[PDB]
Amino acid sequence: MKPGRVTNQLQYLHKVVMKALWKHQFAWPFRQPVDAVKLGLPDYHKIIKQPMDMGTIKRRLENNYYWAASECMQDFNTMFTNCYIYNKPTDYIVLMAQTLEKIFLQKVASMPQEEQELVVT
């Protein structure tokens, strides 16, 4: 029962912001959920209660899951902050996340400024 739709801002997050992030050389760890067993990560799911990743976000955008851009922005924030909470700040993975976050913020700065719903045929 979660309402979903397409807005101008959600479409921008999909077709502009996610497009840039998905193809980035630092995207690969973030394109699917963290596999805590494979990666040997002690306590990942104790520390991180709301896992998130770009694969999940991309699928949500593709399936018109979100009601508003703010929900999608929240997912991105959770993916980045999860990385910053769990890992040591000097870790390669943190640097990778920071770079993607920077691009995220710079691309979001050109997003349409008033949220308006798009017709979906």
UniProtKB/Swiss-Prot annotation:
Effect of residue 113 to A: Partial loss of homodimerization
Every Bromo domain range: 5-111
Positions that bind a protein: 43, 86-88, 91-92
Cell location: Nucleus; Chromosome
Consequence of substituting residue 44 to A: Abolished binding to histone H4 acetylated at 'Lys-12' (H4K12ac)
Resulting phenotype, residue 91 to A: Abolished binding to histone H4 acetylated at 'Lys-12' (H4K12ac)
Family: Belongs to the BET family.
Note: Some specific inhibitors of BRD2 that prevent binding to acetylated histone are promising therapeutic molecules for the treatment of cancers or inflammatory diseases. ABBV-744, a small molecule, has been tested on tumors with success: ABBV-744 antiproliferative activity is mainly restricted to cell lines of acute myeloid leukaemia and prostate cancer and is able to displace BRD4 from chromatin. GSK046 (iBET-BD2), which specifically inhibits the second bromo domain, is a promising therapeutic small molecule for the treatment of inflammatory and autoimmune diseases.
Function: Chromatin reader protein that specifically recognizes and binds histone H4 acetylated at 'Lys-5' and 'Lys-12' (H4K5ac and H4K12ac, respectively), thereby controlling gene expression and remodeling chromatin structures. Recruits transcription factors and coactivators to target gene sites, and activates RNA polymerase II machinery for transcriptional elongation.
Subunit annotation: Homodimer. Interacts with E2F1. Interacts with (acetylated) STAT3; promoting STAT3 recruitment to chromatin. Interacts with CTCF; promoting BRD2 recruitment to chromatin. (Microbial infection) Interacts with herpes virus 8 protein LANA1.
Domain observations: The first bromo domain specifically recognizes histone H4 acetylated at 'Lys-12' (H4K12ac). It also specifically binds histone H4 acetyl-methylated at 'Lys-5' and 'Lys-12' (H4K5acme and H4K12acme, respectively). The second bromo domain recognizes and binds histone H4 acetylated at 'Lys-5' and 'Lys-12' (H4K5ac and H4K12ac, respectively).
Protein name: Bromodomain-containing protein 2
Organism: Homo sapiens (Human)
Taxonomic lineage: Eukaryota, Metazoa, Chordata, Craniata, Vertebrata
